[PDB]
Amino acid sequence: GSYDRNHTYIVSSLLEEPYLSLKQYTYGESLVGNDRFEGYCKDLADMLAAQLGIKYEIRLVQDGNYGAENQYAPGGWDGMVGELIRKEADIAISAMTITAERERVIDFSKPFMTLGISIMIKKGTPIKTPEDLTMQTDVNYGTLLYGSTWEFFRRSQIGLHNKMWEYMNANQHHSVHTYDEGIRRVRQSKGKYALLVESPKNEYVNARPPCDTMKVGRNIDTKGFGVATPIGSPLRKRLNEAVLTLKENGELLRIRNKWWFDKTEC
């Protein structure tokens, strides 16, 4: 009650199914505003906004990126993280991974979803573990360039992860600027490409047509997605409280089931 509720809060996000996607276009109907979007993060944004009694406007991130340290970006970060640092958005509500490096420059709520880095292959590919990737030649691999998975491997102290880092950094052409390009490569490379991809994305894709991909191995780490705000945001406490409210009252579980379990489909 001591924050501006007339302001339409600007929410940075990023199209990434099923977290956020465009509603299917139809004949003679033009969608505008937030009505253009659907998905888990749309539903989450709606609920958070209702908890806080605020209006919001989704504005997709202007470089299509999650956020990385970049010696060219103003404020030192690109993507959604940079939009928050530079106060171009009020909140980011996306599948944004909570990392130690990002916590030094923006704030996160407690996590609304858990996840881990995982491996996606085309069915038939002879890979069962991360170790396997480093012990063979014909299957190339990669991940989303410069995002949290990229940084995990760069920074990990585990020999295996460092081995995978050295490979990917020396073979950046086998990594991708969107998960959808990586998934296309899995599907089109005849068993010769594996994608390092966060588990909720992996699980979603594998349970939907064309049913030609699968997850192998255990998750490599354990991680969360959080609602992010610029430091100092008057909304920081109330947004964290709202996430905890939605967690406790079963609403996060309900929309996770809506977009993952209710969409299977394989």
Ligand X SMILES: N[C@@H](CCC(=O)O)C(=O)O
Residues 197-226 that bind ligand X (CB under 6 A): 198
Distance between CA atoms of 101 and 92, rounded to whole angstroms?
16
Q: Which two tokens stand for residue 23?
A: 């509603």
93 touches ligand X by CB under 6 A:
no
133 touches ligand X by CB under 6 A:
no
Closest to ligand X by CB, 160 or 245: 160
Q: From start to end of the chain, where are the E strands?
A: 8-13, 21-22, 37-38, 55-60, 91-92, 107-108, 113-115, 117-122, 140-142, 193-198, 213-216, 223-225, 228-229
State the first-to-last Cα distance of the chain, in angstroms, to the nearest integer: 47
Closest to ligand X by CB, 52 or 174: 174
39 touches ligand X by CB under 6 A:
no
**Contact stretch for ligand X (CB under 6 A) within 33-41, 125-133, 143-151, 155-163:** 143-151
Distance between CA atoms of 177 and 64, rounded to whole angstroms?
9
Residues 62-91 that bind ligand X (CB under 6 A): 66
**Contact stretch for ligand X (CB under 6 A) within 94-102, 170-178, 203-211, 212-220:** 94-102
Among 109, 148, 229, 233, binds ligand X (CB under 6 A): 148
Binding residues for ligand X, how many (CB under 6 A)? 10
Cβ of residue 104: shortest distance to ligand X, in angstroms? Answer: 15
Phi and psi at residue 166, to the nearest 5°? -60, -45
> What's the one-letter identity of residue 134?
T
Distance between CA atoms of 235 and 102, rounded to whole angstroms?
18
Residues 163-202 that bind ligand X (CB under 6 A): 198
Among 96, 214, 227, 239, binds ligand X (CB under 6 A): 96
Among 58, 61, 95, 255, binds ligand X (CB under 6 A): 95
> What's the one-letter identity of residue 170?
A
Positions in the binding site for ligand X (CB under 6 A): 66, 95-97, 143-144, 147-149, 198
